[PDB]
Enzyme design. Structure first.
Site, mmCIF file in Angstrom:
data_model
loop_
_atom_site.group_PDB
_atom_site.id
_atom_site.type_symbol
_atom_site.label_atom_id
_atom_site.label_comp_id
_atom_site.label_asym_id
_atom_site.label_seq_id
_atom_site.Cartn_x
_atom_site.Cartn_y
_atom_site.Cartn_z
ATOM 1 N N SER A 91 3.666 0.626 2.672
ATOM 2 C CA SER A 91 4.914 0.036 2.139
ATOM 3 C C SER A 91 5.597 1.038 1.214
ATOM 4 O O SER A 91 6.824 1.140 1.297
ATOM 5 C CB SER A 91 4.609 -1.256 1.422
ATOM 6 O OG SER A 91 3.343 -1.781 1.821
ATOM 7 N N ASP A 140 -2.961 4.022 -3.833
ATOM 8 C CA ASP A 140 -2.897 2.954 -4.851
ATOM 9 C C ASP A 140 -4.188 2.156 -4.732
ATOM 10 O O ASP A 140 -5.103 2.623 -4.034
ATOM 11 C CB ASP A 140 -1.651 2.087 -4.664
ATOM 12 C CG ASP A 140 -1.763 1.093 -3.519
ATOM 13 O OD1 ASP A 140 -1.943 1.549 -2.376
ATOM 14 O OD2 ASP A 140 -1.715 -0.128 -3.781
ATOM 15 N N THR A 167 0.864 -1.219 0.000
ATOM 16 C CA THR A 167 0.000 0.000 0.000
ATOM 17 C C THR A 167 0.883 1.245 0.000
ATOM 18 O O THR A 167 1.936 1.219 0.641
ATOM 19 C CB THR A 167 -0.941 0.034 1.214
ATOM 20 O OG1 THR A 167 -1.704 -1.177 1.274
ATOM 21 C CG2 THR A 167 -1.896 1.212 1.208
ATOM 22 N N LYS A 209 -8.915 2.126 -1.077
ATOM 23 C CA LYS A 209 -8.169 2.321 0.187
ATOM 24 C C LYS A 209 -8.496 3.689 0.785
ATOM 25 O O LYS A 209 -7.941 3.975 1.854
ATOM 26 C CB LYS A 209 -6.670 2.185 -0.086
ATOM 27 C CG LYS A 209 -6.204 0.753 -0.289
ATOM 28 C CD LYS A 209 -5.050 0.623 -1.248
ATOM 29 C CE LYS A 209 -4.494 -0.784 -1.280
ATOM 30 N NZ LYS A 209 -3.013 -0.819 -1.269
ATOM 31 N N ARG A 235 -3.918 -1.751 -5.157
ATOM 32 C CA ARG A 235 -3.572 -3.184 -5.130
ATOM 33 C C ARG A 235 -3.727 -3.676 -3.691
ATOM 34 O O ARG A 235 -3.023 -3.163 -2.810
ATOM 35 C CB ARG A 235 -2.177 -3.367 -5.724
ATOM 36 C CG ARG A 235 -1.511 -4.692 -5.394
ATOM 37 C CD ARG A 235 -0.094 -4.719 -5.925
ATOM 38 N NE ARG A 235 -0.060 -4.720 -7.373
ATOM 39 C CZ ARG A 235 1.053 -4.783 -8.083
ATOM 40 N NH1 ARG A 235 2.233 -4.836 -7.482
ATOM 41 N NH2 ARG A 235 0.990 -4.819 -9.406
ATOM 42 N N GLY A 286 -1.417 -0.872 6.444
ATOM 43 C CA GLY A 286 -1.340 -1.941 7.453
ATOM 44 C C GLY A 286 -2.382 -3.022 7.202
ATOM 45 O O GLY A 286 -2.800 -3.198 6.035
ATOM 46 N N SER A 314 2.339 -1.986 -3.640
ATOM 47 C CA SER A 314 1.524 -0.892 -4.223
ATOM 48 C C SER A 314 1.407 -1.135 -5.716
ATOM 49 O O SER A 314 2.398 -1.599 -6.293
ATOM 50 C CB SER A 314 2.130 0.463 -3.973
ATOM 51 O OG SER A 314 2.294 0.731 -2.587
ATOM 52 N N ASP A 320 7.435 0.166 -5.387
ATOM 53 C CA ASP A 320 7.038 -0.773 -4.304
ATOM 54 C C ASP A 320 6.229 -1.904 -4.933
ATOM 55 O O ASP A 320 5.358 -1.673 -5.787
ATOM 56 C CB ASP A 320 6.277 -0.043 -3.190
ATOM 57 C CG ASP A 320 5.495 -0.922 -2.214
ATOM 58 O OD1 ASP A 320 6.055 -1.934 -1.750
ATOM 59 O OD2 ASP A 320 4.330 -0.569 -1.890
#
Lengths: 228, 239, 238, 229, 204, 244, 219, 276
Positions: free
Chosen positions: G129, G17, G1, G33, G19, G47, G169, G166
């Site tokens: 992340s 993002d 994330t 999100k 994913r 998290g 993400s 990342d």
């Protein structure tokens, strides 16, 4: 008949008869008298002894709540001692939790809140004593009176008990801006000797305490030499 | 919770709430227990055959465990709670001690529960008397009565419910110690007939023998009631 | 009287009747007497006097710790409840401090414990009076506890039935108790107690407990062989 | 610390304290509701003791959630208990089912609380009737809940002082065809019959359920409707 | 792993106005196979079908707890629970146990009977909903199912087409998993009808 | 039986609540709050008959939070008790949500507390009319606006433009209602509003007041904190009243 | 994330993002999100998805209930304090990392809540992340008093850093613009990862898969 | 406060619980409900409150779980209540939970007598513990189980319950019991028990014809089971016939109500010929 059986019940007039009746217990009790001066505060209470054979200091009506503060109980002494025990609990929470001597105004409100709590609930009865809180914490010399209702009020001078009316007449003769704690011990004790019934209550002594600059702002019984 | 004192002493030393729970038992349907040599017989009266109550057979003598059966007198609802409590205790007892619980043991448990109800703040007593019969694993037959006070006694023959004292006074005149399965059943019915309506249909009765509980069929029963009611005619002619 | 039923009901005249009535339990209890001298306290209690050749015993006097004991009047059941409390609190104190609970502090504890019972609806006042008798650093103490929760530091006192006669005797003599020996105190305790006896009955070992506590003397109850030293050679003369 | 029941059966079988609470609920100012084909309107008169009361601080119609709102009659402070609990229930339901609580299920949950206070120890019943109006999958709803716990789905009803005359008046005026703008007209005309003095945006509050939402009319929206009656 | 102990995989797939939900048939204890006739699908109502993967104990306990909640709902609410509400209810139930969770991973297929719009929701063991347009899966063959479903799945598939690619996915993924297989029970839910099909797979 | 517990009478009334309203009047003290364009005032009769009573000590006005002041009318010690509940409630709110309790929420939460004692047997109603005053931030522009919220023993909570509680409250309202037909009352200056409040006090008790015999609380847009108005500033208002 | 917030002149832009991942595998390419907290408050979550979902729902509900009590738009400080106190209570075992953006009467308010219940009220924040990659873009390109367009573009740029650099993400940038008056949630504000190679439709005609039994039920 | 205790859970001097006796008197004020247990099914017929023209339906999706008078407890258990409707709702929810708690544990439908017993254990509690009034509600539980088949139970505020072939609670319970005693027989079709229930309902509330607006009817009966889903649990035995609680619509009741009209009419032509 049911209007006055418990303190959880208002009457039609809007009053709480069980609290008035607790009040009556104080007005039939031994006279107490107190004076708030610049120097500190003084409490004198007449103790009516039932017996010739009591020790000196038996049924002490005046109790140190903290270094700086003391409660004198006019009324049922045992009830009074529950308030003393609470006033102590509050005084020691001030030092334990807030690292400060409890202020007089605070200690009084705390004593009144406690005494009031017992006027709100069917399961308990009102206290049968008016506490006289004398303190000399950071808010200066303060004299307060919590009555059975929980009503706190600050006083320059104050009389409680069966000679309340006459003892007040004599407290009004004092100038409170002027007088010192050393005079007051004299005049307050003198007042209690004057107002006392000699034929009704033969055996009695005048327990005096103070908290003043003299005593290091420490709430103590005054020595026996000052008392007369 | 509500723990006001309900069962309390009155000036004369009476627990009124227990005396009134017994008033509830006197109003209750008569039950009867008769101990024999090899048999316990519990006979109860039913409210009487209303055309509407389900034809499917409901037993008014409750089974506490394989060995132990109880009839009650008093409040149906309260009795159902006691019986469920007794039923549970018998199983709690087999759990905790491999053994099946003796009748005398369970009676004392049930009598203890009834006593607790006369001293628990917040509760009225159980309005229930109980007749508990059965056989200990050893083979000895037991007949007990439990009254609302929680006081329990073993009997050779007993009655609870309406006209209990009329039935007991009648029983103790005619009761004989050693009795056959047939004589017990006879005696139980004869005894119930003292207070219950002349009718055979109201009586329902259970015969306990060691490891053998059997309810009389209404065919088996009407033979005994005919034989008994002809003997009650013989006793009416004598007086 | 519509105000005498509950402890939580003040009368209109400002009396708590359930407390006045619990006090009547104490005044109908059997007489006990307390006298304190310079170094000693003496409790003396009337037991019940054997009917013909038939005895009763009822524990009315209790050791509470080395340095304290009690003489009750009234509901003996409530005496036992205070006895257990005071014993428990004295043990706790002695456990913490390795010294006997000071008597002024103990007096305050019983007072407090009585008071818990005179304000809640659920509870009731203790129907028992105590004579606490103790010895500490501050010397000998005699307290009379009472159902109201009041605690009286006394030079001498009596409690229970016909105790106004005992208190009359004690009032003649109590000024001389700080000068008395232990044997003169016990005479005085008994002479007071014997004023409280009915009609013609005299004090003797079978109908009188004596308990002493003081300097270097732990709280001891004398019955039978121990009491005879004071009671065999005791007569009450006007 | 009182755990004994205050509501008990009389020898006649009536629960006297629930009859008396229902008297308390009849004594409030008139509130009323009108279900339409395409919504529902609930209107209460908020007659203030004096002109010195901040009318806007009086709240006679409440939002319980986006899609349901209520009015009430009787003891205001009692209703605030039911409304606070009903609001909790709409949110608890959303948290569980990520869905608006059906009015059916909300009314049943309010009913249950009324009933607790008719039986539970040391408490008297609520002295207030609710009108609950909302919209769910099953369409538009108007329920009256009473101190008993009893609830009725209504097409139109009234609670409070003039409610027998305001029900009589609604019975004549009400039709199944009745649309929302015609129902709001009818609701306010019913208040106006029992009313003494002119009606204003300060004097009456009006909730309405429309599309998939409950809203309280602003004083501007209420003035548009009060100009027409 | 406690999740891989009992074995079993479940997958659901969205088509045009239809979904397919398909479980393998194996029940195990690690590598020992107890039964080959334990499908993991549960029918809430006409419109909702869910699978539970994970520890069989918890599949069975959780499935009971859900059956309690959905039947209570049906009585109280006087209607069938919807896929969205059912999913939301199931996240609430799994997250009630955040600290001490149910070892289940529910796969929920649903369809709105009116709109025809399909709702899938896989969930992890603590309730985290995953609500994609295409397909969801769970269980021991989930890594391999994702690969098969990604490859074969298209948007607007008819029920019959959708069944074929779901069956070929479940079978091919289960052929590469020790802990899943013995064929599959698939369930093709439409607005109009619910087909259920036992699918011949390996005995391996 | 109806009159001693908290149960409905046959005429649907709670007698113990009707009687707690009588407790508000019994002490014979009258309070008047008034809300102006940029301020709230609360004026309480502050009578100490005893020359030996320390005036400073007996207060009807309490601070609930820096920004919410309170004035309690009725049993002083019941008033004191509700302040402690309000302070608890405010402290608890500030901790839970990280912002000062809005006066209208506090009032409502104190109404909920009062209602509980009307529905649960054995708890006495607090025989006191709580009058909270304070500024409240408008969420539209951020401007503070002055608020009075009363809570009575029934639990009934209300915002006010002006309110009286106590001995001659019916006569003090009558005066403020007569003065509301003349002026807007929300377009008034703090001085003009103070004069109306003090004049209502004076009309109702039927006597001219000294600055000593009243204690005056205050919250302004400028200084939103609840302040006791000093005797000097009240003296200027009473001279301003006795002139006009 | 990777989730991102910037304060601009008129309000807050949040960014996320899309994913979701089960371990090393993308479970949902287009998951949302950016969670509704209140009409004027949004809350991006990183998290543990379960925890972020539960804590964000729980609070949004409490704010909504509290909004009926107050009659007053929810303050972002109230939201912040409810999340802090909840997250703190659970000593980070509720592992929700949050970016709370909103606009109350006090103005734009953007804050992180760390899982242990720390807060940082800042003019630009990142969590997840891809926080560090995203923050690099933000530190490089953030200025005070950005236009809504400058801010949306910056937030998208920041998210893209997470998306591309990342692995947890990916996919698209969801952006949310909380202004004083309204909250515009743009899903796929930027879609940098469209379709490389059109999906080869493998055709399996009905009756391809062998079927032992079949129960049809009509409704 | 002890002064104002009503002492609900105490005996009176005659050994009776007044609060229960009075709660019974509250059920005799309530709407009449008739239960008729046949071999084909059970029938509940109840007296609805006279319908005000502004009464609305709650437009519930499932028509067969609740009405004014009839409530489904579980797929195989229904009920009617007479008394305090708000108490009924409290206890209905308790019953629903208990029947489902049983299904949770045993994964089989709860026996009717077991539910009746659990529901009545709850009512008994409030006559012994807790110093509050009893539940002022009597139930007719109907239902089917594999043990005893079609069953009808009455349930009393005391806690005592009884099995019945046919029974009545509410307004004219005694008058109904007389008219059921006469006309109920062991070998009865559902149509023939539907007829009885409505004739006795019609005669208790003193109407010439059965007023469709004022009567609700529920029917516990077994129907063919459709949604087997055998492939999802191969080892699970699904019975051919499953019990289904159904609350008749106005249209579904009208032929059954016209047949109880015609049977009253034909019985009134017999009363004309008895006098001749």
């Amino acid at each position: 008949s049911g209007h006055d059986q418990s303190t959880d019940v208002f009457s039609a007039e809007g009053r709480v008869f069980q609290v008035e009746y607790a009040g009556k217990a104080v007005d039939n009790s031994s006279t107490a008298v107190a004076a708030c001066c610049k120097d500190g505060v003084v409490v004198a209470v007449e103790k009516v002894h039932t017996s010739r054979m009591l020790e000196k200091g038996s049924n002490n009506r005046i109790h140190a709540v903290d270094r700086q503060a003391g409660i004198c109980i006019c009324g049922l002494l045992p009830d009074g001692r529950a308030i003393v025990s609470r006033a102590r609990q509050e005084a020691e929470n001030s030092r334990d939790i807030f690292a400060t001597p409890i202020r007089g105004s605070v200690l009084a409100n705390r004593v009144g809140e406690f005494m009031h709590a017992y006027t709100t609930h069917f399961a308990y009865r009102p206290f049968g004593c008016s506490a006289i809180i004398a303190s000399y914490a950071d808010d200066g010399p303060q004299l307060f009176v919590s009555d059975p209702s929980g009503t706190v009020a600050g006083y320059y001078g104050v009389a409680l008990g069966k000679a309340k009316t006459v003892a007040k007449s004599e407290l009004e003769k004092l100038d409170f801006s002027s007088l010192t704690c050393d005079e007051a011990v004299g005049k307050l004790a003198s007042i209690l000797h004057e107002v006392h019934d000699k034929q009704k209550d033969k055996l009695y002594e005048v327990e005096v305490a103070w908290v003043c600059d003299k005593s290091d702002r420490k709430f103590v019984h005054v020595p026996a030499d000052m008392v007369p | 919770s509500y723990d006001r004192a309900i069962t309390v002493f009155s000036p004369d030393g009476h627990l009124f709430q227990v005396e009134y729970a017994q008033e509830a038992v006197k109003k209750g349907l008569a039950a009867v227990g008769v101990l024999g040599s090899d048999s316990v017989v519990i006979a109860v009266e039913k409210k009487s055959a209303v055309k509407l109550q389900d034809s499917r057979t409901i037993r008014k003598i409750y089974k506490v465990d394989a060995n132990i059966y109880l009839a009650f007198a008093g409040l149906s609802a309260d009795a159902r709670v006691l019986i469920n409590k007794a039923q549970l205790e018998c199983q709690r007892f087999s759990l905790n001690y491999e053994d099946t619980m003796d009748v005398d043991m369970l009676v004392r448990y049930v009598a203890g529960v009834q006593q607790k109800s006369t001293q628990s703040g917040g509760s009225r007593p159980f309005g229930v008397a109980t007749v508990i019969g059965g056989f200990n694993e050893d083979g000895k037959p037991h007949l007990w009565k439990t009254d609302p006070s929680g006081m329990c006694s073993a009997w050779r023959a007993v009655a609870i419910g309406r006209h209990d004292q009329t039935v007991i006074e009648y029983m103790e005149k005619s009761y004989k110690d050693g009795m056959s399965r047939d004589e017990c059943v006879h005696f139980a019915i004869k005894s119930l007939l003292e207070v219950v309506e002349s009718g055979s249909r109201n009586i329902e009765l259970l015969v306990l023998q060691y490891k053998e509980a059997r309810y009389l069929t209404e065919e088996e029963l009407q033979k005994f009631v005919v034989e008994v009611e002809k003997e009650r005619e013989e006793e009416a002619a004598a007086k | 009287n519509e105000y005498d039923s509950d402890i939580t009901t003040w009368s209109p005249t400002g009396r708590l009747f359930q407390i006045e009535y619990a006090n009547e339990a104490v005044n109908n209890g059997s007489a006990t007497v307390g006298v304190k001298g310079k170094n000693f306290v003496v409790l003396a209690a009337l037991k019940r006097s054997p009917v013909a050749e038939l005895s009763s015993y009822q524990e009315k006097v209790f050791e509470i710790d080395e340095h304290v004991g009690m003489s009750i009047s009234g509901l003996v059941a409530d005496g036992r409840v205070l006895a257990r409390y005071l014993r428990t609190e004295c043990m706790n104190y002695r456990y913490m401090y390795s010294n006997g609970m000071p008597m002024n502090q103990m007096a305050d504890m019983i007072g407090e414990k009585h008071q818990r019972h005179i304000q809640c609806s659920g509870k009731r006042p203790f129907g028992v009076g105590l004579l606490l008798a103790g010895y500490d650093r501050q010397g000998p103490h005699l307290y009379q506890t009472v159902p109201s929760g009041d605690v009286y530091d006394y030079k001498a006192t009596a409690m229970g039935v016909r105790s106004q006669a005992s208190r009359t005797y004690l009032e003649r003599h109590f000024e001389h108790f700080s000068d008395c020996t232990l044997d003169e105190l016990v005479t005085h305790a008994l002479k007071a107690l014997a004023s409280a006896t009915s009609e013609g009955i005299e004090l003797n070992v079978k109908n009188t407990t004596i308990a002493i506590v003081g300097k270097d003397t732990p709280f001891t109850i004398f019955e039978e062989e121990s009491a005879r030293k004071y009671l065999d050679g005791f007569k009450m003369r006007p | 610390e009182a755990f004994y029941g205050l509501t008990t059966f009389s020898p006649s079988g009536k629960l006297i304290q629930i009859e008396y609470a229902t008297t308390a609920a009849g004594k409030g100012t008139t509130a009323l509701g009108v279900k339409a084909t395409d919504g529902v309107v609930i209107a209460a008169k908020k007659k203030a003791p004096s002109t010195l009361v901040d009318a806007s601080s009086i709240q006679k119609v409440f939002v319980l959630d986006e899609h349901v709102g209520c009015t009430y009659s009787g003891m205001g402070p009692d209703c605030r208990v039911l409304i606070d609990s009903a609001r909790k229930n709409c949110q608890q339901y959303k948290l569980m089912y990520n869905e608006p609580i059906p009015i059916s299920q909300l009314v049943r949950k309010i009913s249950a609380i009324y009933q607790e206070f008719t039986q539970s120890g040391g408490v008297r019943p609520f002295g207030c009737s609710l009108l609950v109006a909302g919209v769910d999958a099953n369409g538009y709803h108007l329920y009256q809940v009473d101190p008993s716990g009893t609830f009725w789905a209504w097409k139109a009803t009234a609670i409070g002082t003039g409610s027998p005359d305001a029900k009589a008046f609604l019975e004549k005026r009400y039709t199944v065809d009745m649309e929302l703008e015609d129902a709001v007209h009818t609701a306010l005309l019913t208040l106006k019959e029992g009313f003494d003095g002119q009606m204003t945006s300060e004097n009456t509050q009006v909730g309405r359920v429309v599309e998939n939402r409950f809203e309280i009319l602003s004083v501007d929206q209420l003035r548009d409707y009060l100009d027409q009656i | 792993s406690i999740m891989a102990y009992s074995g079993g995989s479940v997958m659901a797939m969205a088509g045009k106005e239809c979904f397919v939900i398909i479980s393998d048939n194996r029940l195990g204890e690690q590598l020992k196979t107890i039964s080959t006739e334990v499908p993991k699908l549960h029918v809430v109502n006409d419109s909702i079908v869910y699978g539970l993967t994970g520890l069989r104990t918890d599949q069975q306990t959780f499935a009971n707890k859900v059956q309690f909640r959905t039947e209570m709902y049906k009585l109280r609410e006087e209607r069938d629970i919807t896929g969205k509400a059912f999913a939301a209810m199931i996240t609430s139930m799994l997250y009630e146990a955040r600290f001490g969770p149910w070892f289940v991973e529910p796969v929920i297929g649903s369809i709105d009977k009116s709109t025809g719009e399909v709702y899938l929701c896989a969930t992890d063991l603590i309730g985290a909903p995953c609500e994609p347009e295409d397909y969801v899966c769970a269980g021991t063959a989930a890594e391999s199912l994702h690969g098969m479903c990604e490859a074969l799945w298209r948007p607007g598939m008819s029920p019959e087409e959708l069944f074929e690619i779901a069956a070929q996915a479940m079978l091919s993924a289960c052929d590469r998993d020790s802990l899943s297989g013995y064929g599959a029970v698939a369930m093709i839910v439409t607005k109009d009808k619910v087909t259920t099909r036992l699918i011949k797979g390996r005995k391996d | 039986f109806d009159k001693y517990i908290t149960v409905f009478s046959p005429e649907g009334s709670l007698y113990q609540v009707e009687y707690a309203f009588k407790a508000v009047t019994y002490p014979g003290l009258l309070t008047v709050a008034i809300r102006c364009k940029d301020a709230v005032l609360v004026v309480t009769q502050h009578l100490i008959p005893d020359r030996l009573m320390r005036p400073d000590s007996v207060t009807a006005l309490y601070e609930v939070t820096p920004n919410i002041g309170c004035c309690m009318t009725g049993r002083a010690p019941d008033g004191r008790a509700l302040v402690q509940r309000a302070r608890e409630e405010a402290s608890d709110y500030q901790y839970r949500y990280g912002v000062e309790i809005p006066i209208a929420v506090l009032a409502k939460r104190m109404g909920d507390k009062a209602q509980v004692r009307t529905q649960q047997a054995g708890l006495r109603p607090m025989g006191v009319v709580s009058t909270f005053i304070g500024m409240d931030q408008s969420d539209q522009d951020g401007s503070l606006k002055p608020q009075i919220y009363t809570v009575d023993p029934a639990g009934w909570t209300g915002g006010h433009i002006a309110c009286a509680a106590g001995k001659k409250q019916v006569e003090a309202m009558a005066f403020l209602e007569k003065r509301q037909k003349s002026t807007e009352l929300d377009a008034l200056t703090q001085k003009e509003a103070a004069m109306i409040a003090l004049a209502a006090l004076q009309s109702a008790i039927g006597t001219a007041v000294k600055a000593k015999e009243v204690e005056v609380g205050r919250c302004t847009a400028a200084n939103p904190a609840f302040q006791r108005v000093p005797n000097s500033e009240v003296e200027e208002w009473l001279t301003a009243v006795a002139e006009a | 994330t990777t989730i991102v917030g910037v304060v601009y002149r008129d309000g807050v832009v949040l960014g996320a993002d899309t994913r979701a991942t089960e371990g090393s595998i993308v479970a949902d390419k287009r998951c949302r999100k950016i969670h509704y907290m209140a009409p004027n408050i949004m809350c991006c979550g990183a998290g543990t998805s379960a925890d972020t979902e539960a804590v964000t729902n729980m609070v949004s509900s409490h704010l909504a209930l509290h909004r009926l009590e107050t009659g007053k738009q929810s303050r972002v400080l109230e939201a912040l304090t409810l999340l802090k106190r909840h997250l703190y209570r659970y000593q980070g075992h509720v592992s929700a990392a949050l970016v709370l953006g909103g606009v109350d009467v006090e103005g734009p308010f953007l804050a992180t809540i760390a899982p242990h219940g720390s807060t940082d009220r800042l003019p630009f924040v990142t969590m997840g992340s891809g926080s560090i990659a995203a923050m690099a873009q933000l530190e490089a390109a953030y200025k005070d008093n950005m236009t809504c367009e400058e801010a949306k573009e910056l937030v998208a740029s920041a998210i893209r850093k997470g998306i591309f650099n990342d692995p947890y993400s990916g996919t698209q940038v969801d952006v949310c613009v909380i202004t004083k008056d309204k909250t515009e949630l743009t899903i796929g504000y930027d879609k940098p990862n469209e379709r490389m190679y059109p999906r080869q439709e493998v055709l399996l005609p009905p009756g391809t898969t062998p079927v032992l039994k079949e129960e049809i039920r009509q409704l | 406060s002890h002064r104002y205790d009503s002492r609900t859970t105490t005996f009176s001097p005659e050994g009776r619980l007044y609060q229960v006796e009075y709660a019974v008197e509250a059920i005799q004020q309530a709407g009449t409900v008739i239960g008729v247990c046949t071999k084909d099914g059970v029938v509940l017929a109840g007296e609805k409150m006279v319908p005000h023209p502004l009464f609305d339906s709650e437009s519930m999706q499932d028509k067969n779980t609740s009405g004014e008078k009839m409530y489904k407890i579980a797929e195989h258990i229904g009920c009617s209540v007479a008394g305090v409707t708000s108490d009924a709702y409290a206890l209905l929810n308790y019953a629903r939970l208990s029947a489902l708690r049983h299904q949770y544990t045993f994964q089989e439908p709860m026996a009717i007598e077991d539910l009746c017993r659990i529901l009545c254990d709850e009512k008994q509690l409030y006559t012994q513990y807790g110093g509050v009034r009893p539940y002022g509600v009597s139930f007719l539980l109907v239902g089917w189980d594999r043990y005893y088949g079609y069953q009808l139970y009455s349930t009393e505020p005391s806690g005592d319950y009884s099995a019945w072939s046919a029974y009545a609670i509410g307004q004219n319970d005694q008058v109904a019991h007389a008219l059921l005693k006469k006309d109920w027989h062991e070998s009865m079709t559902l149509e023939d028990g539907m007829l009885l229930a409505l004739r006795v309902l019609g005669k208790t509330m003193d109407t010439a014809k059965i007023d469709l607006d004022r009567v609700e009817v529920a029917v516990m009966r077994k129907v063919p089971a459709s949604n087997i889903d055998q492939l999802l649990d191969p080892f699970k035995h699904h019975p051919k016939t499953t019990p289904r609680f159904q609350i008749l619509t106005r249209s579904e009741l009208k032929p059954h109500a016209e047949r109880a009209d015609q049977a009253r009419e034909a019985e009134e032509k017999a009363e004309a010929e008895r006098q001749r």
